[PDB]
């Protein structure tokens, strides 16, 4: 059990234990009387004359992991009679070494609004202990982010791999105008971090946030019916790096899409617009590499079409017909003529006024009618009408907007009670 | 009815009526034989000698509203024997006149962000018909506002009085930079607007909206512990007119209020601030006329106190004591020293790091302890401790922030296994 013949053997011993202790008692048989220890003794392992193998110094896995020893039996004369046989000492590991970061100071940089979770810098540390045991198994962690807005982490670190990346929130909020420069303190721990007794090292990471010039531009307003020569530049986008191939992606599949994009990222309008066909547009600008692989998120472009006065007022019909009783007196409501304008509601482009131009016949007098200037309502201006005297009136009404006029024809039929 | 003794009476007749019938037959007993009509006859009202009172053409309430007539009975000689008595003709009104605006074009202006509902311009119209009847009772109304942003009315009009003012939304969103200049078309209707037969007039109203320079300034950042001469200008407010009386109002009603305002509207900090007693301030700037009237709403002032590193790290107590057993081996965790810094959390001002300076005694050797640079945790660095070789260690730990260093003292008592 702690004694026995010379045969191949392996013992496993913890390093860093008190330089006492026996390993094993080897047993003789005549003609053999003494024993000899050779190999990687490293002035640590010793055999007594009569078979007692032991070590006299602390072992160290880090200086040497396995000791390859040989034990021979000698006869009384001093000649080898058994062996040598190999005795193997496996030095079992303890956590006697602190992890060390390969640099005390790190620098990285990351583009604003880059994919969260993507490595931009690695911090690497090592531990001289056994990677196949807690003792040499490392766990990284952010100690502080400086500066820090409202307890919100803009960076994170992969607890195993040492990869530093932006969080969701960093991708989104990190702005080099507000804050171009961040310090991270990183801690590494052995024992996979899972012990209060683990050994720790720290290091410093300076991070520069580089500019992103790929952003959604300001909403565009374009006047319809452009009298100017086309195409016209209306907005632009720029990829961070040169060489990109620019597309425009039209989200509805419109009949004519009157915007396109050139190779510098300039967005042009091809044609005149018409408010009256098409009020507004949304589409996307996309950046490509030489390979046809999208470079980033697409960009939302908005075009508002401003109205011009490019439709005149129209008549509700070739002749609009109203009937009035003779028993009706000064100020009767007769009817409302409502002309239409295709230009933009509630603007001066579509805001009609009304004037009576002609009245035939003028009997018994002219001016028997008024039309309310904006409501378009016809009232009797003077007296009652008399079917006996004239059965019917024909009015020419001038409907006009800001800079167009239109003539519309109204018939007033006189009826009895 | 239609006949009776000569007595005071009152009849009511529509204007614009061509007469078809007499008004009344007055009867008198002998000695009375004929009758006489006097007063406001306007060569319209007539009495026949035989007592027959009537009118001879259309009346007009606008030319005359009440006719005050007298009828007397006469004798064969021509002497009065009854009366004269008052006969009253009330001319009942009809809606034969359009309302008219006194001007076809109106011009006004209003200061941006002024009191909504407050008249700045009056449009007046008149109607010759009877105020006491729908026929001469006027109703104003906006036809259109040009331009109009997102179907939102920036102006309104008092339907009776003709007063034009800003709506709530005009007060708030009207921006003279984007758009200083608005047209209103205003309609007036008789019949109190309630009839589709009413008569209408319209007018044009041109409005310029003047700029408001009375606005809340951008929030201020002021460093604490200013070494500069006080008071220090930090922001400003301006009323639209000169002669405003600028004041400051502290809501928190603090013991020490370290801001002031001068008569130009300039806002000062009066003293050094200290983040560590007081982090931020809010107060209000107020404008008054020379009698004490809030020239307008108060203005909200925000002062953020920026931190400087002006407190050094502190010790959790003069001596911090931990106990270690002899059976504790390399790397066993002993204890955590947590120093304090009053400066701003989660900044470099308060971010402590730890170094062991001294270990006494150095027996059996120096360097038996390490401290985790930021966690402040003491671990055994080399070997076990032995009460035989000293019952106690004394460590001097240098706690330092960005600019200051402080020595804190840790005592390790070596004790027996249990
Ligand atoms: C760019 O602006 C042009 C205006 O300079 C736009 O042309 C207008 O197009 C509308 C719709 O097609 C036409 O409206 C028609 O109006 C006629 C009566 O028009 C009469 O009025 C004008 C006097 O202003 C006179 O020039 C003519 O002799 C006509 O007698 C109605 O019968 C129809 O129902 C219809 O409403 C306009 O007439 C036309 N104006 C002109 C000057 O050509 C053009 O569409 C704009 N383009 C875009 C694409 O936005
Ligand atoms: C403006 O800045 C001033 C200086 O930066 C601030 O003065 C500080 O006031 C605090 C407490 O009110 C003091 O902190 C005390 O520190 C001692 C230990 O002090 C030793 O170390 C300091 C710094 O190196 C050294 O100067 C001394 O000689 C000492 O040997 C503790 O025992 C206290 O509890 C407390 O922490 C600072 O001592 C003092 N610093 C200085 C450099 O004068 C001032 O209060 C600031 N005012 C505002 C309005 O912000
Ligand atoms: C009112 O307008 C109508 C429509 O044009 C007139 O009637 C036309 O009169 C012409 C000759 O003047 C005839 O040849 C047509 O047969 C009529 N058209 C129709 C369909 O009735 C009418 O004359 C006008 N009346 C007045 C009093 O102006
Ligand atoms: C770090 O560096 C060492 C070489 O000295 C290498 O063997 C190791 O694989 C590297 N680790 C990481 C996490 O990239
Ligand atoms: C380390 O990272 C993985 C996620 O990648 C996570 O599941 C695990 O919980 C983390 N370890 C600790 C101790 O947080
Ligand atoms: C006009 O305003 C009065 C109060 O001034 C209000 O009571 C009345 O309802 C309004 N009339 C209409 C038609 O809204
Ligand atoms: Ca070792
Ligand atoms: Ca280790
Ligand atoms: Ca080891
Ligand atoms: Ca058009
Ligand atoms: Ca139009
Ligand atoms: Ca148009
Ligand atoms: Ca009249
Ligand atoms: Ca009247
Ligand atoms: Ca009237
Ligand atoms: Ca302070
Ligand atoms: Ca401070
Ligand atoms: Ca500090």
Residue B266, SS3 per DSSP: strand
Chain CA centroid to CA A281, Å: 24
Judge contact between B73 and B80, C-beta under 8 A.
Answer: yes
Q: What value, to the nearest 5°, has the Cα angle with vertex A51 and ends A50 and A56?
A: 105
Inform me whether the C-beta atom of residue A185 falls under 8 Å from chain B C-beta atoms.
yes
Q: Ligand 2: which atom is nearest the Cα of residue B342? A: 36
Contact by Cβ (8 Å): B406, B399? yes
The separation between CA A78 and the C-alpha centre of its own chain, rounded to angstroms, equals 81
Q: What stretch of H or E contains B169?
A: helix B168-173
**Domain B319-415 in the same topology as domain B100-210:** yes
- Is B84:B38 a contact under the CB 8 Å cutoff? yes
Cα–Cα distance measured from residue B355 to residue B345, given in angstroms and rounded to the nearest whole number? 21
CB B391 within 8 Å of CB B418:
no
A158 lines ligand 4 (CB under 6 A): no
**Structure-determination technique:** X-ray
Q: Which atom of ligand 4 is nearest to the CA of A161?
A: 13
CB contact under 8 A, B185 and A374: yes
Among B234, B246, B180, which residue's Cα sits nearest to residue B208?
B180
Give how far the C-alpha of residue A10 lies from the chain's centroid of Cα atoms, to the nearest Å: 58
Query: Tokens at residue B84, please?
Result: 């004269």
What's the first-to-final CA gap in chain B, in angstroms? Answer: 132
How far is A47 from A37, CA to CA, in rounded Å? 6
> Distance (Å, rounded) from C-alpha B110 to C-alpha B106?
14
Task: Name the 3-class secondary structure at B168.
Answer: helix
Nearest to A205 by CA among A181, A189, A175, A178: A181
Element (H, E) at B411: strand B405-415
In chain A, residues 209-228 whose CB comes closer than 8 Å to chain B: none
User: Beta strand A200-210 with A105-111: parallel, antiparallel or unpaired?
Assistant: parallel
B26 within 8 A of B48, measured Cβ to Cβ: no
Beta bridge partners of A304: A221, A280
**Cβ–ligand 4 contact at A124 (below 6 Å):** yes
What is residue B284's three-state secondary structure?
A: strand
- Written as one string, the DSSP assignment of B204-263 is EEEEEEEP----PPPPEEEESS--S-SSEEEEE---SSTT-EEEEE-SS--SS--EEE-T
Residue nearest to atom 14 of ligand 4 (CA): A124
- What Å distances lie between residue A399 and A266, A276, A309, A312, CA to CA? 44, 20, 15, 9
**B347 close to A (CB below 8 A):** yes
> What φ, ψ does residue B54 adopt, rounded to 5°?
-160, 175
- Please state, in angstroms and rounded to a whole number, the distance separating the CA atoms of residues B251 and B219: 17
CA pair distance B255, B271, nearest whole angstrom = 14
Distances (CA, A) of A168 to A107, A119, A156, A157, A215: 21, 13, 10, 13, 18
- Which chain A residue is nearest to residue B186, measuring alpha carbons? A374
- Nearest-atom number in ligand 1 for the CA of A406 is 21
Ligand 9 centroid to residue A17 C-alpha, Å = 12
> Strand pairing of B232-236 and B319-325?
unpaired
Q: How far is the CA of A343 from the centre of ligand 11 (A)?
A: 5
Report the Cα–Cα distance between both ends of chain A, in Å, rounded: 136
Strands B200-210, B181-189: pairing kind: antiparallel
Q: State how far residue A263 is from chain B, nearest Cα, in angstroms.
A: 35
Q: Is A147 on the interface with B (CB under 8 A)?
A: yes
Binding site membership of A360 for ligand 3 (Cβ less than 6 Å): yes
State whether the beta carbon of A162 lies less than 6 angstroms from ligand 4.
Answer: yes
CB B332 within 8 A of CB A198: no
Judge whether A198 is closer than 8 Å to chain B, CB to CB. yes
Of A56, A64, A60, whose CA–CA distance to A14 is shortest?
A: A60
CB contact set of B172 (below 8 Å; sequence gap of 6+): B113
Whether domain B100-210 has CATH 2.60.40.60: the reply is: yes
Among 2.30.42.10, 3.40.50.280, 2.60.40.60, 3.90.180.10, what is the CATH number of B220-306? 2.60.40.60
Q: How far is residue B10's CA from residue A188's CA, in Å, rounded to a whole number?
A: 112
Report d(CA B169, CA B255) in Å as an integer. 39
Domain A3-92 homologous superfamily, CATH? Cadherins (2.60.40.60)
**Interchain CB distance below 8 Å, B147 and A96:** no
Q: What is residue B269's three-state secondary structure?
A: strand
The count of other CB atoms within 10 Å of the CB of residue A125 is: 21
Task: Retrieve residue B31's tokens.
Answer: 């000695």
Q: Among candidates A33, A39, A28, A49, which has minimal Cα distance to A70?
A: A39
Cα separation of B199 and B135, whole Å? 9
b/e per residue B223-232 (b: at least 16 CB within 10 A): ebeeeeeeee
Write the class of the CATH domain A319-415.
mainly beta
**CB-count burial class (<10 Å; 0-12, 13-18, 19+) for B50:** exposed
Q: How many residues does chain B have?
A: 418
Query: According to DSSP H, which parts of A224-373 are helical?
Result: none
The region that residue A237 occupies, defined by phi over 0 for left and psi between -120 and 50 for alpha, beta otherwise, is beta
Could you tell me the two tokens for B254?
């603090």
Query: Rounded to the nearest 5 degrees, what angle is found at the Cα of A355, between the Cα atoms of A354 and A360?
Result: 130
How far apart are the C-alpha atoms of A350 and A403, rounded to whole Å? 10
Both tokens assigned to B21: 């019938």
Token representation of residue A355: 């004037």
Longest dimension (CA), chain A: 166
According to DSSP H, which parts of A148-277 are helical? 168-173
Within 13 Å and on the Cβ side, how many CA atoms surround B368?
Answer: 24
**Among B344, B372, B375, the residue to mutate for chain A (most A Cβ within 10 A):** B372
Domain spans in chain B, listed from the N-terminal domain onward:
3-92, 100-210, 220-306, 319-415
Instruction: Give the three-state DSSP class for A190.
Output: coil
Spell out the residues 6+ positions from residue A205 whose beta carbon is closer than 8 angstroms to its own: A106, A107, A108, A121, A123, A164, A183, A184, A185, A186
B18 interfaces chain A, CB cutoff of 8 Å: no
The residues facing B47 across adjacent strands are B53
Residue A242 token pair: 């040169």
Phi, psi for residue B186 in degrees, rounded to 5? -110, 130
Length reported for chain A: 417
Query: In Å, how far is A188's CA from the nearest CA of chain B?
Result: 11
CA distance A344 to chain B (A): 11
**Closest Cβ opposite residue A200 in set B330, B347, B372:** B372
State how far the Cα of B344 lies from the Cα of B338, in Å rounded to an integer. Answer: 16
**Closest chain B C-alpha to A92 CA, distance in angstroms:** 16
Residue of B15, B17, B45 lying closest to B136 (CA atoms): B15
Task: Say if ligand 6 is within 6 A of residue B194 CB.
Answer: no
Report chain breaks in chain B, C–N > 2.5 Å, as residues after which they occur: none
CA atoms in the 13 A half-sphere facing the CB of A172: 5
Those residues whose C-beta lies under 8 Å from the C-beta of residue A269, and which sit 6 or more positions away, are A222, A226, A230, A231, A232, A234, A258, A259, A303
How close B195 comes to chain A (CA, Å)? Answer: 9
- How far apart are the C-alpha atoms of A313 and A352, rounded to whole Å? 7
Give the mutation target among B159, B164, B165, B191 for probing the ligand 6 site: most ligand atoms within 8 A of CB.
B159
User: For chain A, what is the radius of gyration of the CA atoms?
Assistant: 49
């Amino acid at each position: 059990k702690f004694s026995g013949p010379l045969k191949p053997m392996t013992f496993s011993i913890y390093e860093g234990q008190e330089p006492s202790q026996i390993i094993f008692q080897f047993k003789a048989n005549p003609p053999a009387v003494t024993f000899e220890l050779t190999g990687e003794t490293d002035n640590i392992f010793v055999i007594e004359r009569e078979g007692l193998l032991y070590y006299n110094r602390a072992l160290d896995r880090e200086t040497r992991s396995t000791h390859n020893l040989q034990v021979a039996a000698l006869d009384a004369n001093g000649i080898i009679v058994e062996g040598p046989v190999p005795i193997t000492i496996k030095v079992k590991d303890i956590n006697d070494n602190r992890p060390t970061f390969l640099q005390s100071k790190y620098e990285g940089s990351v583009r604003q609004n880059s994919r969260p979770g993507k490595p931009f810098l690695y911090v690497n540390a090592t531990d001289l202990d056994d990677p196949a045991t807690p003792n040499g198994q490392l766990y990284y962690q952010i100690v502080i982010q400086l500066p820090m807005i409202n307890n919100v982490m803009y960076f994170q670190i992969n607890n195993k791999t040492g990869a530093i990346s932006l969080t969701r929130e960093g991708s989104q909020e990190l702005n080099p105008a507000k804050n171009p420069s961040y310090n991270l303190v990183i801690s590494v721990k052995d024992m996979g971090g899972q012990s209060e007794n683990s050994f720790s090292d720290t290091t410093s990471v300076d991070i520069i946030v580089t500019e992103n010039i790929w952003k959604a531009p300001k909403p565009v307003e374009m006047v319809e019916n452009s009298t100017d020569p086309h195409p016209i530049k209306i907005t632009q986008v720029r990829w961070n790096d040169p060489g990109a191939q620019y597309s425009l992606v039209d989200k509805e599949k419109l009949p004519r899409f009157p915007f396109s994009i050139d190779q510098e990222g300039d967005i042009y309008v091809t044609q005149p617009l018409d408010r009256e066909e098409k009020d507004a547009y949304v589409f996307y600008a996309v950046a490509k590499d030489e390979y046809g692989k999208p470079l980033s998120y697409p960009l939302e472009i908005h075009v508002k079409v401003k109205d011009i006065n490019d439709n005149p007022p129209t008549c509700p019909s070739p002749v609009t017909v109203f009937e009035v009783q003779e028993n009706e007196r000064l100020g009767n409501s007769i009817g409302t003529l409502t002309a239409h304008d295709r230009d933009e509601e509630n603007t001066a482009n579509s805001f009609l006024n009304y004037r009576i131009v002609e009245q035939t016949p003028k009997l018994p007098m002219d001016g028997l009618f008024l039309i309310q200037t904006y409501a378009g309502m016809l009232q009797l201006a003077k007296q009652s009408l008399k079917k006996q005297d004239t059965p019917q009136y024909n009015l020419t009404i001038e409907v006009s907007d800001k800079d167009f006029k239109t003539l519309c024809f109204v018939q007033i039929n006189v009826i009895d009670e």
